[PDB]
Design a protein around this ligand. Structure first.
Ligand SMILES: Nc1ncnc2c1ncn2[C@@H]1O[C@H](COP(=O)(O)OP(=O)(O)O)[C@@H](O)[C@H]1O
Ligand SMILES: Nc1ncnc2c1ncn2[C@@H]1O[C@H](COP(=O)(O)OP(=O)(O)O)[C@@H](O)[C@H]1O
Ligand SMILES: O=C(O)CCCC[C@@H](S)CCS
Ligand SMILES: O=C(O)CCCC[C@@H](S)CCS
Ligand SMILES: [K+]
Ligand SMILES: [K+]
Ligand SMILES: [K+]
Ligand SMILES: [K+]
Ligand SMILES: [Mg+2]
Ligand SMILES: [Mg+2]
Lengths: 374, 97, 374, 97
């Protein structure tokens, strides 16, 4: 792990949707992609591995965590073979591609395996505030890197895998230059509806409105990765449907629709999913994004928000307890402003793992406050 | 006798405070203490207070266990030593210059 | 300032609305209030003064900041006279009250004076990221303490000032045990409408809906300080009206209403003000709460949110750029859960003033990223 | 000649980096440097990178001013000294054991 220290000290190179698109449409030179990836992938792995090493020992010890580490090590080492192998050889080029397939395969279970690890750790050592926020910090970073890893690999395999019959032939790798947002909204709805009907025997209807301020009558389109947007929508629709159907299961009123407003401004594409599922007290809003606080695993909301933040967007939730909840996905309207947001291992990151509890900054009441009556 | 050490006494942490409950220890026996680290939550009638380490060293021994109610002002709460080499001596309960 | 060090080391004693109410309704013993305040007020002042001393020197140097410090010092010293003066003397009791009036008066300009200071400092030394967030941290704490200070003084003067003709006779000091939320909403609206009509010669209408989940037909009432809630509403209504009227000033459509939903759940009282004033890109949402980024001084939104957070509530803004904005005030439904949230000076706080810039945790793109096309 | 000092050279901060722009200094001449403090923003083609101090001391002198584009790998960027007493010597541009 001298090679890991060194790679972990390198800074990652965040790419924009624009760049992925410009590269795939106008360039699409395999050499170039190889020279980039043979280096960028070990940099990204090493940045993460260094952070997994900083985890509390009780968590580091879990077989699931140790298994993830060794998958990452195996991948890192396999990619490092390519540091001194010339692109000017169509032979190297082809093996490198196979290597990408292999590491993508090896990494397929990373998310559930890691989750397993922290579940093992929570159930065996109890839930602790300062450690909790630490794990949160870690998982956000670790899962975002995993997402970016799969992004890079998919672009290269989709572009150079030499596939005769591409599933989405007008796309650039996994990027749809004309992604119709409402269509992805309807598809995500339908697939949630299906799972909700299966178990509850009923599901609210979707209503979709659009407002394209950019140009008021045109269908809203964005340059984006449709599978990412799909994942986000599906997760929110599923939450909205569950809450709606659970609330009205003993009422006579009839189920309110789940509403979607899609809007496009100079900078933002925004998607608001509103339900009348009764809402959630403010005190619990932030826990909904905790992995370890947590029919139909408490990962849907944190992972969804990682997909949104990954290209400089965000995912926010706002409730009125007693009535309902708005969930808003914000994406960048412009591909030139949609840069990867990648965790960098440095001293700032290290400090987050090395911080011990501090006194609260702000006051806290007694759990048994003095009775002011007498 | 014992190596150079220091007792941490429970102060009046608020102007009306006469006693406090040791709700939670935030340091373990063995751990290094820096000035301003969080040492314990102390609960009164009036507040839950983050009690900070005022002098650096190592936690040698805990005198008042977690959950002790109504500990008076002035009671020794724990023993602090300069170097970690000295800790083992205190599993038994002035060059401190 | 040995007395200041000592008092700054004391912890503040956060009170609940319940306690203020139980004390004023069922007890209302002046002795008790004196014994509390003669100590609590110097504790709160000293906590703040210590923090103003940690400000950057360029800011500390501004005559406005120095003037605030000496007002606080003067107040601190005047209150410290009372540490050894017996309550069992109706004479002491009366002078102490006069002292409270005097310090309330002396403090009347604190907010504008401090603002002036940071404005002087920004215009003279330029806007700086790591220092900006520092000032933000400081102002939130400093203004909240000032609010809590005025809370405590008002309760004592209102309860024992011996006023023959109280403006709000059924209230407990400044606390309304049956504050009708919609009435305060209408009043805040009307007074914004007035200022908006004056300058723009037009103003949107208010629409108010309620949903009392606690008990579905009853007017929503809360135990609260009406002047605080008023301040919050007025500020949001003014923003909503300005945005609405500015957007439609050149349109033929006719002005959309400003809508208010008031909801009451088991824990939350929520108030959502929605407008169609065209919204605000996400990137700018957080700056709206900066004092120093900043017709009708950029303090309305940060101060309003300090009032909300002060009794464990919050104030949040969510926009869809191109359409409009929702602003939500969250208050605690239960007075027993509405504790003051007070800034405590300790090492945690000190660290915030002593922190130098760190490397970003997460990646940042080049300002001139490589052209992937060629 | 000069008191014990150390040159901070511009590393390859990313694997493809051959040069960098010194966008911003985050430390002043005179200031104490701890290991891991933010020293400069370095801009490439590929990223804006927070460059961290790797050894502790004091900033003695800045060699490359803010705004210098295309500084090669290896160029001395600044001079660091052990004690602050030594700084004044460097307004003039091996016991470092
Ligand atoms: N729209 C919504 N309405 C009401 N409650 C919600 C909504 N969205 C999320 N929640 C709450 O937040 C929790 C976390 O959601 P998530 O992370 O998707 O995990 P899961 O759905 O597996 O619980 C849910 O269990 C639910 O209690
Ligand atoms: N409802 C709203 N719609 C559109 N823009 C808003 C809204 N609320 C606030 N803003 C923006 O946020 C800014 C800050 O508001 P505030 O702190 O009240 O100061 P001021 O109103 O004096 O500018 C406003 O200048 C405006 O640009
Ligand atoms: O370096 C830099 C430019 C990157 C160009 C190729 C990118 S888009 C990788 C292909 S996945
Ligand atoms: O101490 C504590 C109880 C406080 C009781 C009196 C409070 S309500 C001050 C009057 S403003
Ligand atoms: K790194
Ligand atoms: K969750
Ligand atoms: K204090
Ligand atoms: K503002
Ligand atoms: Mg879910
Ligand atoms: Mg305003």
């Amino acid at each position: 792990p001298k090679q890991i220290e060194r790679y972990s000290r390198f800074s990652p190179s965040p790419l924009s949707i624009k760049q992925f698109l410009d590269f795939g449409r106008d360039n699409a030179c395999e050499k170039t992609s190889y020279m980039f990836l043979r280096k960028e992938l070990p940099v990204r792995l090493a940045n993460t591995m260094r952070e997994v090493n900083l985890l509390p020992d009780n968590l580091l010890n879990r077989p699931s965590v140790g298994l993830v580490q060794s998958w990452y090590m195996q991948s890192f080492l396999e990619l490092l073979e390519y540091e001194n192998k010339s692109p000017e050889d169509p032979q190297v080029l082809d093996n490198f591609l196979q290597v990408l397939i292999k590491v993508r395969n090896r990494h397929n279970d990373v998310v559930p395996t890691m989750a397993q690890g922290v579940i093992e750790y929570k159930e065996k050592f109890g839930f602790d505030p300062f450690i909790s926020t630490n794990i949160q910090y870690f998982l956000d970073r670790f899962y975002t890197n995993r997402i970016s890893f799969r992004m890079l690999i998919n672009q290269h395999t989709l572009l150079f895998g030499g596939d005769t019959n591409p599933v989405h032939p007008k796309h650039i790798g996994s990027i749809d230059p004309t992604c119709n947002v409402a269509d992805v909204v309807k598809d995500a709805y339908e697939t949630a509806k299906m799972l909700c009907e299966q178990y509850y025997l009923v599901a609210p209807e979707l209503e979709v409105e659009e407002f394209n301020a950019k140009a008021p009558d045109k269908p809203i389109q964005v340059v984006y990765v449709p599978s990412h947007l799909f994942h986000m929508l599906f997760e929110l629709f599923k939450n909205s449907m569950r809450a709606t159907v659970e609330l009205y299961e003993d009422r006579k009123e009839g189920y309110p629709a789940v509403k979607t407003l899609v809007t496009l401004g100079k900078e933002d594409l925004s998607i608001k999913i509103s339900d009348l599922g009764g809402g959630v007290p403010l005190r619990k809003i932030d826990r909904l994004f905790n992995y370890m606080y947590s029919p139909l695993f408490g990962y849907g909301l944190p992972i969804s928000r990682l997909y949104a933040r990954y290209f400089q967007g965000d995912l926010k939730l706002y409730s009125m307890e007693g009535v309902g909840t708005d969930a808003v996905i914000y994406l960048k309207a412009l591909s030139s402003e949609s840069f990867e947001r990648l965790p960098v291992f440095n001293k700032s990151a290290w400090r987050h793992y090395k911080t011990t509890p501090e006194a609260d900054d702000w006051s806290n009441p007694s759990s048994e406050p003095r009775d002011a009556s007498k | 006798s014992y190596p150079p050490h220091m007792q941490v006494l429970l102060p009046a942490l608020s102007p009306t405070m006469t006693m406090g409950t040791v709700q939670r220890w935030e340091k373990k026996v063995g751990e290094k203490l820096s000035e301003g680290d969080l040492l314990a939550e102390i609960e009164t009638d009036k507040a839950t207070i983050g009690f900070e380490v005022q002098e650096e060293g190592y936690l040698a021994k805990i005198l008042v266990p977690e959950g002790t109610r109504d500990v008076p002002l002035g009671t020794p709460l724990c023993i602090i030593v300069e170097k970690e080499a000295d800790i083992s001596a205190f599993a038994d309960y002035t060059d401190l210059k």
